[PDB]
Write a protein that binds this ligand. Structure first.
Ligand SMILES: Nc1nc2c(ncn2[C@@H]2O[C@H](COP(=O)(O)OP(=O)(O)OP(=O)(O)O)[C@@H](O)[C@H]2O)c(=O)[nH]1
Ligand SMILES: Nc1nc2c(ncn2[C@@H]2O[C@H](COP(=O)(O)OP(=O)(O)OP(=O)(O)O)[C@@H](O)[C@H]2O)c(=O)[nH]1
Ligand SMILES: Nc1nc2c(ncn2[C@@H]2O[C@H](COP(=O)(O)OP(=O)(O)O)[C@@H](O)[C@H]2O)c(=O)[nH]1
Ligand SMILES: Nc1nc2c(ncn2[C@@H]2O[C@H](COP(=O)(O)OP(=O)(O)O)[C@@H](O)[C@H]2O)c(=O)[nH]1
Ligand SMILES: [Mg+2]
Ligand SMILES: [Mg+2]
Lengths: 428, 24, 426, 428, 426
């Protein structure tokens, strides 16, 4: 039995999980009541006669997001006790979500970790979905990844984090929450995919040409990425890349596990039939420097280990010819210590469409989880965000007033500072 | 209610009656 | 000639044996109504081994049924192949052995004893002879372990020359019910060494392990538990019922399988035991039956014979196979792995060939081997007995119903003599 | 023929009897008019053609708790002289149920017990059903049991008292009634299982999701537990359990007979078909520390023996696999002198549903009665509330002045000291 | 009546070997449900070599499927000609061992070799001489190279004189998937040089190159890359299954191709291979079949034999032939190309004519050649290994599963030794 548990913490975690579970239910044929009219085993159980309950722990510290799912069209699809709801929020304060308010809600949520793991045989990992840019996702994100590392600390941890955005930002204490989250994201995390905000905004500019799309359209693009991550688990494939191969061919040293995503083609109904979208062209747009969901230019960085997740009617020769043409391109600069570096997998299942979505019927799609040294400057801007605010102790009287000692700011700053030093010495 | 001692094996034991793609 | 009488005892004894009278009646071709439909003489030439005759041509099993609680008596009577039993062979109490060994041996089971020896006497005395008595019971319970061995002792007094074939279910190592498993087990194997004969071994976790790997039952049943034991019933008693080339009655099994009188614990096993997926892919020949029957994943005891040594072994072949094709297979299995056979008895194996196969299969073999490895089981019975007895646990039932802690500590002292005796014979 | 006698006494006596005898009549096809439109022999008689008259001895001192069944929907069900009530209650006073008023009602109550046991074919048990911190349940229970031990001093006597709770409470004289009634519960009771009222409260809040259970909803959960305890005495079964098998196999040293109880699943209709009710999962909920129906958190104790009953479509291969996981769980530990022992029965008939109740239709059930040494912590909190009230002789003149002499308090204190003591070096 | 135990390991080995069992089933008349279909005795008498005999009647293959991921064997079972296989020889595992030689050799696959080797024993001692262990596995993954290295080691210590062939596929330089492929090859060659008799080296670029410039396939796939390997493996073991003018089995291949025991990494080939118009346009003379063996285009290595010296070369001819042109086509290629052949061996050649051609064609050749030019394979694997190991890239998931860095330095020391003795032999 192949299965994996999806954690969703935070406002971003639940709302990305809404698009994820919408798309996973569509692919497996499971209706919003659970009754469909062995591919389901990774994301759904077999309760009752046809009740396929999804495999997730919806956790947030507010009522507002969780109860609205409990009053939505997916009310009697989830197990309603899997939707653990908090009672007051962390209030964009890492101290509240990690020390005072989060010291109770983790105990109930980990109780559903125990039941979702005992219900299943052959557990593989934890797809945690959290924001980092505020409370809850950083606070409960820290505390859940700590205690899951001591009682389930032998399995993979795929954490698709939402790092703070470079220029646009909908919080001012947001630099404090993510500097105070690399103390858990550095060691209590097996893979930390960094997703951004303008990076899906400007994929939506140039590719989907939607002038004014919403967070729902961001979450749909992330959901199509996640369905391509765990694509060889549920479905068949020529080259299958299971959860332990996304990390034995991508993580070169135990500290360097901050990878970046690249789906292609994020294409609308207009341009889909106007192009001949094929295995060579899709990976050329996947290596386009603006196609990162990070706002992180891979040109002033350099690659170390790239993973490709071809999906649909893809023939293995065409992976080979397209990987060769990517390798011969001069602007794409790999590393000396990896003559290889293209972990390619092929799924026979074509990518699905959400009806009335933003994506067209496309036969072939490539997801690209790539590890480079360019991720270092993503942390370098947030290091500069930290030290203007911490120059004269701005917004500290809530962090220290809720239980933290004041030294945790400098300890997390020097830990984050040693991370870019590690990313600079890895590419000498 | 003899539902525990089900005959799931006849007189010879031989227990009683009761995705892959294409790369052609 | 060769009367064998079933003395079914305990809850477990009556559904083990109800399937015994379901597979023996199938092999001899008797409907539950008591008539015959097989149209063959060789089927009806040793009916008297297990079936006394009655007026109007109806056979009855020579089978004394015995319990202290009438619920499982109702289940045997109501089920199929169950209304063939004589109604005064249904000797049952109304109180119920509550898994207390004192409750069978020194109180209420003991007032039903004078009724159960009466019905044993009536189906044994009036005949020409009887080869022995067959007894299935449930060591670890109240009835089969309790007054069950009290019927063993009293039959041993009445007929101290006939053989006592006892199919006993020892406690499970991994897990089981009935917390007083150790108290029933050691006190019963006290007297199963001296008022006894071949005491062959059957275990519930063991038989489970066949029906997970050897047979791949996804949802096994207790009926499938009784059916694999019931297949071994016919194999161990086959030359007393059907002709062969080298006939071997059940006493001939004992004489060439017991070196010293207390050394009488025998692993039982059945072959072929093939799954439906592998039904048509494998073949059926003597090298495959031998590889399966010495295979420790097939043995009905949870003791692993590779952690030991075969003192003497025996086999019950049944089919149209060559008596040659058996006997260099015995020689070859003795010569490859000689580390699992004793050196002080040369050529450690008897073979028997019955002409008539079991029902269905073209050929089959049943293994009755006196391996010394059974002290895996006996030390497991010992080390849980030491835990409960050293801190005086549960004893206010066992002494308050009419015993003392002398009988417990010398049952332990007999028990440790048994593990010691197998040890230097290894 | 198997039979048993139920000895409901007190408000917790009669009202639990109303829930258990509505359950026992519905599961057997017995209407409130009395007749049926072979499992009946252990709870009903056969006066004439039909009319299965129950074999309760429903008893109180005040009439206002017995009169609503003398005029209720079950009026033409019971023998009216089995419904026995005097004029005035004991009023939370042991001496008013054991020395004063009560002698002239014991001689009628045991009179009715005589000519129930006369039309019995071999008696098996005495199910006493009482409150213990109260009045008639304590005093009249102690008189009736002290003289049940002489005229039937050989049969089992299975008591099911409802202990006072540590935090929740109902009257000021819990210490002054339950502490000294352990005389009845130690030298005259063969198995005593305490069903604390506080635990039945929150087990409805968590599992049933009713925030507001009334005494009627409590008594239906207890009625389910009795229906699963004396279940093998009724239906065809697998591995079976009797009251004598329950007696000799769970119980260590003779005074040690104070046990917990737990039901599983106690799920409601919504939380019923969103999860599979596998045998492994329902026994984990049976063993989990918040499911014990007394606040006796078993991680601060020492398990000695457990008796489980798997009612319904339960396969013993699933049972042995499930209890093996209980051994491997390091949270649930067992004493060294009892290395093995998970005495388990399996019935065939599925658990019946009370129409209009709060439990859902479940194919399976697990009823566990276990003897952890954390049951001594019941008496550790209970003695604390005894000694400091007795320190200045509070509420003592209502006792020494009515019928009793002073001195019973001090030796009942010695009895509780030895009761805690005997639970200490047994588990050492 | 010599047997071959065929063990397929890895996802790649399972797919390559499944294509082998359908190109040998149609070559022997075996239906997907095992029944011979025609009426030729020459197609059936040597069925014992790669097939067993069932009492059902079906000729199950002597195949052992072997892969820690239970998804590829589901594909083999559900595919065509997958109903032939015995379900007992489907040793599963449920963990994956994903692209890790440490997990394949020391971690999880370690408690699976004790169960696959029981299946190997059940197939191996069922005769009186085994000829070889034909093993197909990958060297770029975890289950293939790792537990493949476990099985080659324990089979050799159990059986010291039995042959074991290894149609192993090596990691590919130009484009390859697994990033830790140089780690998965350097640690596998070290045991593939001391416990192996024959290692037929196969890549992936030259198999793509064959179906690009001999067949002109615009649409190749992984199936037809495997059908070329299966055709080559069929012709190598052709004399063991079919009569011929000059029979030459697998041991004859070994003794006449290796000068000294470590130099046993051969190059495989198959050389009737026609295009679309060039099926009608191609002659079927022996000299032309000799021409297509000795081309760098029709080599399954991409390790060009022109850049090197043929130590010894052999060609397993098949079909209705003339026994003289089979030899002076070897003599003329050794004389018109004399600088491409080692001087201290006159007659670097073997020809072996079997008389049963593949179906449809008139003749066939399978070239097995020991060359100096396998230098290039080991030196570029050393180049990919040293580039990452000098900075310890991905090392801590080989040390984490339990190793030490000296095992990597010894693995490169053996394979940098492997380029050395091929160098003075040139
Ligand atoms: N990708 C994506 N990011 C979101 C979404 N909603 C909020 N975010 C990001 O999340 C960050 C703030 O944290 P939230 O997830 O909204 O809320 P929270 O993590 O639960 O923290 P609290 O509000 O204190 O409870 C913002 O900086 C946003 O960038 C969304 O729908 N999609
Ligand atoms: N579980 C449960 N407990 C009850 C119920 N009714 C009363 N009780 C318990 O009964 C106790 C009251 O003592 P009782 O002996 O029953 O009262 P009584 O029968 O009128 O006797 P007196 O005290 O003499 O008046 C309280 O502690 C309650 O916990 C009920 O319906 N369900
Ligand atoms: N195979 C089989 N084993 C049984 C059966 N009944 C009970 N057992 C096993 O026998 C042991 C004790 O049996 P029990 O019923 O408690 O004692 P009994 O009433 O005298 O047979 C238990 O561990 C059960 O697992 C049965 O019908 N078949
Ligand atoms: N020729 C061929 N090669 C394959 C096939 N499947 C996988 N491969 C090769 O194997 C490599 C992937 O590693 P894999 O063999 O799956 O690792 P494994 O799971 O340990 O066996 C790729 O480089 C492929 O070239 C196949 O069906 N045919
Ligand atoms: Mg929020
Ligand atoms: Mg009252």
């Amino acid at each position: 039995m192949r299965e994996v548990i999806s954690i969703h913490v935070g406002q971003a975690g639940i709302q990305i999980g809404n698009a994820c579970w919408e798309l996973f239910c569509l692919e497996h044929g499971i209706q919003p009541d659970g009754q469909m009219p062995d591919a389901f085993n990774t994301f759904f159980s077999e309760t009752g006669a046809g009740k396929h309950v999804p495999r997730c722990v919806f956790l947030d510290l507010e009522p507002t997001v969780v109860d609205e799912v409990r009053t939505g069209t997916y009310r009697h699809l989830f197990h309603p006790e899997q939707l653990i709801s908090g009672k007051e929020d962390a209030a964009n304060n890492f101290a509240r979500g990690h020390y005072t308010i989060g010291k109770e809600i983790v105990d109930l949520s980990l109780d559903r970790i125990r039941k979702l793991a005992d219900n299943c045989t052959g557990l593989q990992g934890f797809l945690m979905f959290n924001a980092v840019g505020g409370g809850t996702g950083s606070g409960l994100g820290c505390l859940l990844l700590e205690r899951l590392s001591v009682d389930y600390g032998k399995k993979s941890k795929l954490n698709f984090c939402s790092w703070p955005s470079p220029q646009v930002s909908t919080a001012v204490v947001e630099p404090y929450n993510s500097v105070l989250s690399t103390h858990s994201l550095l060691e209590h995390t097996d893979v930390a995919v960094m997703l951004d905000n303008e990076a899906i905004y400007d994929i939506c500019r140039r590719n989907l040409d939607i002038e004014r799309p919403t967070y729902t359209n961001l979450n749909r693009l992330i959901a199509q990425v996640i369905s391509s991550l765990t694509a060889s688990l549920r479905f068949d494939g020529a080259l299958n890349v299971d959860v332990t191969e996304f990390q034995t061919n991508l993580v070169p040293y135990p500290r360097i596990h901050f990878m970046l995503s690249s789906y292609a083609p994020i294409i609308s109904a207009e341009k889909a039939y106007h192009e001949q979208l094929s295995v060579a062209e899709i990976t050329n747009s996947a290596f386009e420097p603006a196609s990162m969901m990070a706002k992180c230019d891979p040109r002033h960085g350099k690659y170390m280990a790239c993973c490709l997740m071809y999906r649909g009617d893809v023939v293995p020769k065409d992976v080979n010819a397209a990987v060769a043409t990517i390798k011969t391109k001069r602007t794409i600069q790999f590393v000396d210590w990896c003559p290889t570096g293209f972990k390619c997998g092929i799924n026979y299942q074509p990518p699905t469409v959400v009806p009335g979505g933003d994506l067209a019927k496309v036969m072939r799609a490539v997801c690209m989880i790539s590890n480079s040294t360019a991720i270092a400057e993503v942390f370098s801007r947030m290091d500069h965000k930290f030290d203007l605010m911490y120059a004269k102790r701005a917004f500290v009287h809530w962090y220290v007033g809720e239980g933290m000692e004041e030294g945790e700011f400098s300890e997390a700053r020097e830990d984050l500072a040693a991370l870019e030093k590690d990313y600079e010495e890895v590419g000498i | 209610y003899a539902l525990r001692d089900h005959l799931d094996s006849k007189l010879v034991p031989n227990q009683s009656t009761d995705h892959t793609n294409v790369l052609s | 000639m060769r009367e064998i009488v079933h003395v079914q005892g305990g809850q477990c004894g009556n559904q083990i044996g109800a399937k015994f009278w379901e597979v023996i009646s199938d092999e001899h071709g008797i409907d539950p109504t008591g008539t015959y439909c097989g149209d063959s003489d060789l089927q009806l030439e040793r009916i008297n081994v297990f079936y006394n005759e009655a007026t109007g041509g109806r056979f009855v099993p020579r089978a004394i049924l015995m319990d202290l609680e009438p619920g499982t008596m109702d289940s045997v009577r109501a089920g199929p192949f169950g209304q063939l039993f004589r109604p005064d062979n249904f000797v049952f109490g109304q109180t119920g052995a509550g898994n207390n060994w004192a409750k069978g041996h020194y109180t209420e089971g003991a007032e039903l004893i004078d009724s159960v020896l009466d019905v044993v006497r009536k189906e044994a005395e009036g005949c020409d002879c009887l080869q022995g008595f067959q007894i299935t019971h449930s060591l670890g319970g109240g009835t089969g372990s309790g007054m069950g061995t009290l019927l063993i002792s009293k039959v041993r007094e009445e007929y101290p020359d006939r053989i006592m074939e006892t199919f006993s279910v020892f406690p499970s190592p991994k897990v089981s019910d009935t917390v007083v498993e150790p108290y029933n087990a050691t006190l019963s194997v006290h007297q199963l060494v001296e008022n006894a004969d071949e005491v062959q071994v059957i275990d519930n976790e063991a038989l489970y392990d066949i029906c997970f790997r050897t047979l791949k039952l996804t949802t096994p049943t207790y009926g499938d538990l009784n059916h694999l034991v019931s297949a071994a019933m016919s194999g161990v008693t086959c030359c007393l019922r059907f002709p062969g080339q080298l006939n071997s009655d059940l006493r001939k099994l004992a004489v060439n399988l017991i070196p010293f009188p207390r050394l009488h614990f025998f692993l039982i096993g059945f072959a072929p035991l093939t799954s439906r997926g592998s039904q048509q892919y494998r073949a059926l020949s003597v090298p495959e039956l031998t590889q399966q029957m010495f295979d420790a994943k097939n043995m009905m005891c949870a003791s692993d014979p590779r952690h030991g040594r075969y003192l003497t072994a025996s086999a019950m072949f049944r089919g149209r196979m060559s008596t040659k094709e058996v006997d260099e297979q015995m020689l070859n299995v003795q010569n490859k792995n000689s580390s699992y056979f004793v050196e002080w008895i040369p050529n450690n194996m008897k073979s028997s060939v019955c002409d008539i196969p079991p029902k269905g299969l073209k050929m089959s073999v049943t293994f009755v081997g006196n391996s010394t490895a059974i002290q895996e089981m006996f030390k497991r019975v010992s080390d849980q007995f030491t835990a409960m007895f050293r801190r005086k646990a549960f004893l206010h039932w066992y002494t308050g119903e009419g015993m003392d802690e002398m009988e417990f500590t010398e049952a332990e002292s007999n028990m440790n003599d048994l593990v010691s005796e197998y040890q230097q014979y290894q």
